[PDB]
Amino acid sequence: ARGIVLEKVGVEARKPNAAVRKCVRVQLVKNGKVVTAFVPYDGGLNYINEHDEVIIERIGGPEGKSLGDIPGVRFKVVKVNGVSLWAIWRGKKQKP
Amino acid sequence: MKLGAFYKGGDLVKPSGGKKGRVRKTKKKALGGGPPQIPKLGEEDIRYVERVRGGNHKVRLRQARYANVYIPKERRHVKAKILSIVSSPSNPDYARRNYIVKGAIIQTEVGKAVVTSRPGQDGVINAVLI
Amino acid sequence: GGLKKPKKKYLAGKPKKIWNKQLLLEELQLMGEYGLRNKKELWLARARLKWIVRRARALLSMTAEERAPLEVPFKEKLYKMGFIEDPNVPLDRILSLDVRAILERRLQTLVFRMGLAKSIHHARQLVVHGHVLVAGRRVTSPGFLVPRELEDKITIE
Amino acid sequence: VHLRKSLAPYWWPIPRKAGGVWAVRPSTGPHSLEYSLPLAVVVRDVLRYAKTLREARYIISRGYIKVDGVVRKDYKFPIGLMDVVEIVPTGEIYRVVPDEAKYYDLKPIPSSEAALKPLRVEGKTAVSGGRIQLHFHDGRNLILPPDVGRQIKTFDTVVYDLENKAIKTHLPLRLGQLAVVTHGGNIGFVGQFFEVVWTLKRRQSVVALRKGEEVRRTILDYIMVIGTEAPVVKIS
RNA sequence: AAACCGGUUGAUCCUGCCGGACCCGACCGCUAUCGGGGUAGGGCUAAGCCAUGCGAGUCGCGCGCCCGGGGGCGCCCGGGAGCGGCGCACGGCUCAGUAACACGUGCCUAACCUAACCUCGGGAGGGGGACACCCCCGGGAAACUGGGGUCAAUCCCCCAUAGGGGAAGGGCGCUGGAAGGCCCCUUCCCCGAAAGGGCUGGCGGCCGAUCCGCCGCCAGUCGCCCGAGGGUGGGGGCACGGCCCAUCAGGUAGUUGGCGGGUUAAAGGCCCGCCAAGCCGAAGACGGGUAGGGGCGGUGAGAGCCGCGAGCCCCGAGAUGGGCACUGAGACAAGGGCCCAGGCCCUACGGGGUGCAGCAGGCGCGAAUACUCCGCAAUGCGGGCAACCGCGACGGGGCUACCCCGAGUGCCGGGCGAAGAGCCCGGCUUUUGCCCGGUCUAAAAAGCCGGGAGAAUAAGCGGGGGGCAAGUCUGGUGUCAGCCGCCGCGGUAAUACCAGCUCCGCGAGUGGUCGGGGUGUUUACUGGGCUUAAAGCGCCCGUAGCCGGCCCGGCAAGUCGCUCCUGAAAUCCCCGGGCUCAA
Ligand SMILES: [Mg+2]
Ligand SMILES: [Mg+2]
Ligand SMILES: [Mg+2]
Ligand SMILES: [Mg+2]
Ligand SMILES: [Mg+2]
Ligand SMILES: [Mg+2]
Ligand SMILES: [Mg+2]
Ligand SMILES: [Mg+2]
Ligand SMILES: [Mg+2]
Ligand SMILES: [Mg+2]
Ligand SMILES: [Mg+2]
Ligand SMILES: [Mg+2]
Ligand SMILES: [Mg+2]
Ligand SMILES: [Mg+2]
Ligand SMILES: [Mg+2]
Ligand SMILES: [Mg+2]
Ligand SMILES: [Mg+2]
Ligand SMILES: [Mg+2]
Ligand SMILES: [Mg+2]
Ligand SMILES: [Mg+2]
Ligand SMILES: [Mg+2]
Ligand SMILES: [Mg+2]
Ligand SMILES: [Mg+2]
Ligand SMILES: [Mg+2]
Ligand SMILES: [Mg+2]
Ligand SMILES: [Mg+2]
């Protein structure tokens, strides 16, 4: 689904691990619901801004629920402004 | 005639009394019906020929004055005149409004007769004396 | 409400567990000897091999009366393709048929096994460029499964 | 009115998939749609005289094809069982006969038996004047006086003169005659009538045919009597 | 290939879930040379709104008129605006309504209609009229439309006869399993045909170059009317089969039936007058939810599960929402009509149009989508005697990582390199890319055949701690950043992160998220479990249901065997053949 980034928020990894997984808060265009979406990759949060359309997609993990050490997050960002985040992170394209 | 105002299609009710939906939104013209055309007692006979399904024709008696009364006891046919409608067993409102239907009694010149044809469909009043 | 569309014909020979060491070793040998392009060609050979064996399995399970009209013609058709050597073997003898017997019928292999080329990859290149005439006609598909009677007609340009 | 190629009859001698999405539809002639083949299909497929539909229509449009003594210039005319097809400029004659493989075949016949057609009586009706009307397997009719039409029961085969509009020979349906199966799985078989299980509906009676000693069974509806040990006209 | 592997423990045997590996479907990321086959593409999203164009005509052998060229016998040919006939109810699209005689299978209409067409029997006599195009004028912005004059018909109408309908009485007779049917007889009432028209040739007659016809006959051919049957299409009826929920248990009152009527082409509470209280329901009514049905499709070794049950074929329904009619054989009619609701458009303000769920196309929505292209040559259809005409049906190509199939991105030897990649040397080939010719194609394109230069023009995607094939190599960070389907790493010496090198899997593909199947004997019919892991109602009486002793005789319902009529085509399995093999 599509969405608009509102605020870059950070969730903490579960107890045995120690880290601040950097996600973002998104509002879905088709519903208006607000979801927390995980921004993957090293430095991937730096390619995200406020008020940019991002394509929101499931994070994987068991049964469509959250992933391993990230608590209570079901989505991850795949596209930012119509270009794939992996493409920007790999340098194969640049953000528009 | 085939008129949707007199639609002869099936009900929307099951034998259990429950309601069922409409498989077809429109009323088919093939399942259409028509208004009654049974003749009324009048001072002259007026016949109307009607085109029906398949380019066929049906004779309609708009206004009835004579009846082809037949005497069983004599085996003669007389084109007697009609004076009044005595009684209509199917519905008294036919006799009350001077409308001739099959099975109705008529006080003809020769006497009484029971109408033996469907005057809205046959187009003539065949009568048998009582 | 379902529309039929074609499916891959090499799936029957494809292994559902590709990440086996001994499986990887055996298949890598087969591609080397016969000079195949990818594992799809190797699996396509096995899919043919599964047909010959599964068909022979079912004919065994058929009754003696039912098996009779199809028994000899099935073995005869196997003989003419060059997969088998005796068209009069017992039916259970076909069950132990091996995938190399199908790979030998490839047109690329026959060009190499007939001494018409320097290497198996050269013989593939010969067929690809159109220097191999099968009964006077250019047959440019190296995976062509030549039957028995056509084998003696293979020439170079 | 159209006829999709999928909805064409199964026995027609045309490819099922390859071709257009359409098939030539017979024009309600003297047969049934399930058991008739249009004239343009015969000229293009069964005789191969035309390579396209326009060429087949051109050949038919010249009146070159005669069907049962009448020149048919309609390319959608239906042809069926026991019909006599004659090609005028070549002089060849065929009788569409029940075939064991093609289900219906164009067999060449001698010129003498070209005017003759064997018709199976499908029923009789009483018409005005007290005369009797006979209905045959291809819808053809023939009005007869009441006494002559009394002795021709249903399923009797009569050899009809197309040239005189008369009855040459009447073949009653009795046990022990030569019959040809004209519909169903056992089509093309000719054998002796030697067994019947008369059901409540006579058209559904079980009948058996023998040819020494292959025995086939059908219903009484699906067999035409072609005479005694010698078939009256060439069918095979 | 009828398969397991990881994880709860200090260790162990279980239970039981969750994960990995596979196939297919949708969307998306990175990458992308060529060809062949295929009924792939706004379906899974709004049946949301639409600029523009194209999307059903044909017939001069039904008819008169006008115009141009030609010729004398009686006209020839081309063209125009029309009348008229037939068709436009087929074809194309989409999936809102529908849990229903909608759909499927098997049967009926003895309760029905049907233009075109086929066959048999019969018929074609007499007499009239009007309206277009046109001419003289218009009105109006336009849409459309008025008056007078005037030539025809296969245009419309009347008269006759045939024929047809009803009511009633009789019958030998026919069909058929069975007559409220057909046929014949009698009585009355009632309705009520036709185009002998066109063409061709022959004959004769009338007439005249201001006519180029009219009349009688004959034959050939194409037509017209009636009766019967067939054919096709359609209306209607029946038996059975196929979703979920009881946190839905009573529902129904024209409701169920009877009698008499109306209407219909035709049976029926279809509708109406009267009479009764019946009808449905725990063998699940009623209510709610979801859904077009089937052929079929995906998956699995199978039983089975699921619907990707979108695309192709058959049936159904619909044409902005809701209704109602004209014509017609057939519509209550997607590019016809009228009314209401809700929009929009042009206008000269008096009016007039329109709703793309047609083919392109635009906006909108959405994660998500093609050309405002070519041809009626193939396949068919409507019209025509024919010739032929028309057709966004259909065919052709364009675009598109649509499905399947066949290939290339070099081959041989040598050295350096590592046995690798790569570099260089020597020789070879041109699939392929490029240029040209023939063939093909409606025409192109592609394909095929042949010719020229040339190694020359062409590889990515995901991974290396286990599952699971691949690095305890190196640099960087230092429980931070990052990874991670699960297990689990990272807090200084990281085989798990960021990088280099290297290797692994598959390869014109390879990945990510979803959905189905397998996984899974975690739905258990095959084939699970219930002392303690989840799981025996606290106990009992019993309705439906399910399950039930022995022997003898009968039937043959189930059941078993054979055969027949069937279960559309496509799809599926086997066999043969044809495209170079393949698809
Ligand atoms: Mg977890
Ligand atoms: Mg299994
Ligand atoms: Mg432990
Ligand atoms: Mg699982
Ligand atoms: Mg749509
Ligand atoms: Mg004509
Ligand atoms: Mg004209
Ligand atoms: Mg017209
Ligand atoms: Mg249609
Ligand atoms: Mg006037
Ligand atoms: Mg007429
Ligand atoms: Mg009658
Ligand atoms: Mg008259
Ligand atoms: Mg006239
Ligand atoms: Mg009635
Ligand atoms: Mg009712
Ligand atoms: Mg489509
Ligand atoms: Mg509406
Ligand atoms: Mg409409
Ligand atoms: Mg619309
Ligand atoms: Mg054409
Ligand atoms: Mg391929
Ligand atoms: Mg070395
Ligand atoms: Mg070309
Ligand atoms: Mg890499
Ligand atoms: Mg690494």
Ligand SMILES: [Mg+2]
């Ligand atoms: Mg390993």
Ligand SMILES: [Mg+2]
């Ligand atoms: Mg890893």
Ligand SMILES: [Mg+2]
């Ligand atoms: Mg269990």
Ligand SMILES: [Mg+2]
């Ligand atoms: Mg207890």
Ligand SMILES: [Mg+2]
């Ligand atoms: Mg309890």
Ligand SMILES: [Mg+2]
């Ligand atoms: Mg009890």
Ligand SMILES: [Mg+2]
């Ligand atoms: Mg039984």
